[PDB]
């Protein structure tokens, strides 16, 4: 039970998700064909959460792939693990998003959203008891920002009691990968505060540093960045798929981590992360995995946690480990960094321990941080939004698609309402 429908929007969400289903198939022993080839029966005990069993003992992913251009769909279906998907799920347009929120949320995306929701509703009826939906997309693109946040608004109306966690790639501080990404992110964060139960802010600048500084990859491709996200994506739901000594699910990580219904913007983290040479020069213990998470250089969002306070922290562990060694370290980071945690939430760490490690590792972790440190994430975008909007630059590509200037004023006011809330509970005593 507790099945999850995975939705992939944008070029980015399709490239993350094609690496995500590479991890899930490896954890459950699934071949490129779709047939089970593992050894343990613990892989098939909760196989149904990410898989529909087809006839002939084949498992197909419960993934819905959405794009507005057919270029990304050809990359999936011709690449490895592309034949595993149902060809009914590949719902793609022809025009492309045009790197535009309005062409993804109003013009081309609304023509395709009924082609997706009829597949969303078809997958949701085959599920026995639906857990909730996860969406992988970006905020700087057009399909991941426009078509993606359109799907959330149309699903939360149809499924208001379910969880809607998004794995949203957030625009980076240093480089801009899109000239209109302050416009695309701000119009999406307007949609994410009203329709998602939790949201996982990922920066490309942060994953560049982790591949360079921590993993010592001088030349990391996108597929090396996607392997970092996909190990985090499976790490959030690993106690839902495998037995553990203290199980969590997507609702336990929602209840424990969201003290206020707007404040659900998380920064992820993963441990251990070692190079090829520097893996034999380090012991894999729970105090090592703890101290690797709670620093700044292991955040997959490009914002220093030391400029803020953690409201709530979820550290989901994997592998055969002892609970005292876990519970000592979660206390240990709260003592010595008591200024770095919020005061009026005592004992703000959620602990989940699975029994199954990732492939080829002895034990692992997954950090889910809900800090006030992402107020600098939205102070930067709302500054980059206001600098562009005060001259009304690039506005006629969105005004020309049925939108007014009022939509931008309300979305920028909603973000400055949100930054004021993270500023409030950082200074609240």
């Amino acid at each position: 039970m507790r099945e999850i429908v995975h939705i992939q929007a944008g070029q980015c969400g399709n490239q993350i998700g094609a690496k995500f289903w590479e991890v899930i198939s490896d954890e459950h022993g699934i071949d490129p064909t779709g047939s089970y080839h593992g050894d343990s029966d613990l892989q098939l005990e909760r196989i149904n959460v990410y898989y529909n069993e087809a006839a002939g003992n084949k498992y197909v992913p419960r993934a819905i792939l959405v794009d507005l251009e057919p270029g990304t769909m050809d990359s999936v279906r011709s690449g490895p693990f592309g034949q595993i998907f149902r060809p009914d799920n590949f719902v793609f347009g022809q025009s492309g998003a045009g790197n535009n929120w309005a062409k993804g949320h109003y013009t081309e995306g609304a023509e395709l959203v009924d082609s997706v929701l009829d597949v969303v509703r078809k997958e949701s009826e085959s599920c026995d008891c639906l857990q909730g939906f996860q969406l992988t997309h970006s905020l700087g693109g057009g399909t991941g920002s426009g078509m993606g946040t359109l799907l959330i608004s149309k699903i939360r109306e149809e499924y208001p009691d379910r969880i809607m966690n998004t794995f949203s790639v957030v625009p980076s501080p240093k480089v801009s990968d899109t000239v209109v990404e302050p416009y695309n992110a701000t119009l999406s964060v307007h949609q994410l505060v009203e329709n998602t139960d939790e949201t996982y802010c990922i920066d490309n600048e942060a994953l560049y540093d982790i591949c360079f500084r921590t993993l010592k990859l001088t030349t990391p491709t996108y597929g090396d960045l996607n392997h970092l996200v996909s190990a985090t994506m499976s790490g959030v739901t690993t106690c839902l798929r495998f037995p553990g000594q203290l199980n969590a699910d997507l609702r336990k990580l929602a209840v424990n981590m969201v003290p206020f219904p707007r404040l659900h913007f998380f920064m992820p983290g993963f441990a251990p992360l070692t190079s090829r040479g520097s893996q034999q020069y380090r012991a894999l213990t729970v105090p090592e995995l703890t101290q690797q998470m709670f620093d700044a250089k292991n955040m997959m969002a490009a914002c220093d946690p030391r400029h803020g306070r953690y409201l709530t922290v979820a550290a989901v562990f994997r592998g055969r480990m002892s609970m005292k060694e876990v519970d000592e370290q979660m206390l240990n980071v709260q003592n010595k960094n008591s200024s770095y945690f919020v005061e009026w939430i005592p004992n703000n760490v959620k602990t989940a321990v699975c029994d199954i490690p990732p492939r080829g590792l002895k034990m692992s972790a997954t950090f889910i941080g809900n800090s006030t440190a992402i107020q600098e994430l939205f102070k930067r975008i709302s500054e980059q939004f206001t600098a562009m909007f005060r001259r009304k630059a690039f506005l006629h590509w969105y005004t020309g698609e049925g939108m007014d200037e009022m939509e931008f004023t309300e979305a920028e006011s909603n973000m400055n309402d949100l930054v004021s809330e993270y500023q409030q509970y950082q200074d609240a005593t």
């Binding site: 025009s95 990968d177 600098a387």
Partner: protein, 432 residues
């Protein structure tokens, strides 16, 4: 399935397309016969047999340049109804291109566009290759961009203009044809990529070490620009960018849609060695003012939006390592309202080398499409070339005698004076 047809107007448009469609057949393994011994679909429609034909409309009002295509090596490639000729050229006359000779076959060209657009299931937009100097490239294009904006409207219509050089001009009435074509195509084109001849004269001499470059050599470099722009449609890339995304990221205001193309690396075989050509090395090549392909000083202006279109063995981490240094540099300054001034596209395919070409086989490249304030000095020159000639009313009787009003010149000059102050309005900083 993301089809894109291209129009080639004037002698400059066709001779660019002779290098472009030579290049596309090499990138897709297509023979000159249209044969090959599924990614071609954006520019090639396929027949019932194994013969692929291009989605191109070659139009000229004189038959000389087309009959070299009809008898050349690529005779068997092109559909013979697409190679559209007139009888007499527009002959460096905008009025003959727009009123006298242009109206005779404008219904023939639109009929051939519509037969291509019917067999396109995913038609994204148009690629109009023309020049500002010639009468056909100025007159007939401005007639054509009016008609395509009526029939299609929402399609993204990209122009690739040969902008006239300041000190190098091959015709006398180039300041007349350029102003009269820009007044017309302003409200009808969506993004027009300026290219200059004198700057590519400089690049073929300095960077390619050619003493004597031909128009054949210049059209090879402009073919590499268009092949890098349309690289994301024709090939699977790590970070793709479509034709609708260029007009979104580069056009802040509907008047200002004139970026300038810049390609790197431009090296020969003797300099194919002796440097490693990292993605940081070729990116600092583009923002260098000597390597741009429009004779303007980008240090004398501010970049409004840049578009770095990488391709080949390009690693996305070193991309961010390259671009973040450029925002620190003082010589590359942006506009106050634009903190986010980059669009990045990465493709996996390296740019191929045409045999007999003067570029070397590189592992990576970059087509910088930078919209800048520094092109206002280019229009300030061209208005000064217009205001000298029109004050004595020189050459006006060639244009009035073919269907134009004398007051229409003052209408185009007041609009260009309105266009020149738009860069001044954008280039200043914001109060408070």
């Amino acid at each position: 399935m993301r089809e894109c047809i291209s129009i080639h107007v004037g002698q400059a448009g066709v001779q660019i397309g002779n290098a472009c469609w030579e290049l596309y057949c090499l990138e897709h393994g297509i023979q000159p016969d249209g044969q090959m011994p599924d990614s071609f679909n954006t520019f090639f429609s396929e027949t019932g047999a194994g013969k692929h034909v291009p989605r191109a409309v070659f139009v000229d009002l004189e038959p000389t340049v087309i009959d070299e295509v009809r008898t050349g090596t690529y005779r068997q490639l092109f559909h013979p109804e697409q190679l559209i000729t007139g009888k007499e050229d527009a002959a460096n006359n905008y009025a003959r291109g727009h009123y006298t000779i242009g109206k005779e076959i404008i219904d023939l060209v639109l009929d051939r566009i519509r037969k291509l657009a019917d067999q396109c299931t995913g038609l994204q937009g148009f690629l109009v290759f023309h020049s500002f100097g010639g009468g056909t490239g100025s007159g007939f294009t401005s007639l054509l961009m009016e008609r395509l904006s009526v029939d299609y409207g929402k399609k993204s219509k990209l122009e690739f203009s040969i902008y006239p050089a300041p000190q190098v001009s091959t015709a006398v009435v180039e300041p007349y044809n350029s102003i009269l074509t820009t007044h017309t195509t302003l409200e009808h084109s969506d993004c027009a990529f300026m290219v200059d001849n004198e700057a590519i004269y400089d690049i073929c001499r300095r960077n390619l070490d050619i003493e004597r470059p031909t128009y054949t050599n210049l059209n090879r470099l402009i073919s590499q620009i268009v092949s890098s722009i349309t690289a994301s449609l024709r090939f699977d890339g790590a970070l793709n960018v479509d034709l609708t995304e260029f007009q979104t990221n580069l056009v802040p205001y509907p008047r200002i849609h004139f970026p300038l193309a810049t390609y790197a690396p431009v090296i020969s075989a003797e300099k194919a060695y002796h440097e490693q050509l990292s993605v940081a090395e070729i990116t600092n090549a583009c923002f260098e003012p000597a390597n741009q392909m429009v004779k303007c000083d980008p240090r004398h202006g501010k970049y409004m939006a840049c578009c770095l279109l990488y391709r080949g063995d390009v690693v996305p981490k070193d991309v961010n390592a390259a671009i973040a240094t450029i925002k620190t540099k003082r010589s590359i300054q942006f506009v106050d309202w634009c903190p986010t001034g980059f669009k990045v596209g990465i493709n996996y395919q390296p740019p191929t080398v045409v045999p007999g070409g003067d570029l070397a086989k590189v592992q990576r490249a970059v087509c910088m499409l930078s919209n800048t304030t520094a092109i206002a000095e280019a229009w300030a020159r061209l208005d000064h070339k217009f205001d000298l000639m029109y004050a004595k009313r020189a050459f006006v009787h060639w244009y009035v005698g073919e269907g134009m009003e004398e007051g229409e010149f003052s209408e185009a000059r007041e609009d260009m004076a309105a266009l020149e102050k738009d860069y001044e309005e954008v280039g200043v900083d914001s109060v408070e």
